[PDB]
Amino acid sequence: YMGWWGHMGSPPQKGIAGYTISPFAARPFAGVVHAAIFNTFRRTKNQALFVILPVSFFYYVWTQASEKNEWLYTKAGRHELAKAL
């Protein structure tokens, strides 16, 4: 499924012109400030829900479970603990 340089196994390419400039001719950090602020905000915003939803749910679950467990092993929780065992 992959070849090697010269015969990589690409469908025939035609009609694309690629251009680039030397590493010595470019500013490596061109537009870094804009990217660091605006680009990162865009990328983070677009992914935020996929992180926040599961983290918040499982943190809530853990919080409820740890708080119940703590309460069951108090004096006040004696009866509820007796039933739970």
Partner: protein, 124 residues
């Protein structure tokens, strides 16, 4: 899964009025949130191609379609490495998201599945 399976199931849904009424709007939003259009891909560009069947279907593409596919993949790869999105004409509009490959893969698979069936025929 096979593309044949996906296409047949989708046709069952589009037939049923009730089902299409509830599925088609969902699928349109899904595709909007999927975000592949923001890298200038058409849906079909994303189908896994490292299978014998898909290699054969890609070899059957008309040269123009094939050349354009190569460009879209290269362009998307450049957006990906740059962490940029397509803008302007590079964004795939819904009308440009044509199923250019589905007919070819459906034909390749049709023959391969007929071959499997007929390899199991029993003279009655």
């Amino acid at each position: 899964a096979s593309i044949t399976s996906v296409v047949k199931t989708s046709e069952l849904i589009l037939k049923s009025p009730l089902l299409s009424k509830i599925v088609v709007p969902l699928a349109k939003t899904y595709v909007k949130f999927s975000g592949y259009r923001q890298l200038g891909f058409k849906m079909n560009d994303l189908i896994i191609e490292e299978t014998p069947n898909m290699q054969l279907a890609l070899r059957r593409l008309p040269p123009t379609e094939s050349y354009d596919r190569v460009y879209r993949l290269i362009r998307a790869t450049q957006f990906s490495l740059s962490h940029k999105l397509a803008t302007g004409n590079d964004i795939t509009k819904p009308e440009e998201d044509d199923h250019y490959l589905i007919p070819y893969i459906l034909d390749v698979e049709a023959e391969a599945f007929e071959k499997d069936a007929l390899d199991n025929l029993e003279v009655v």
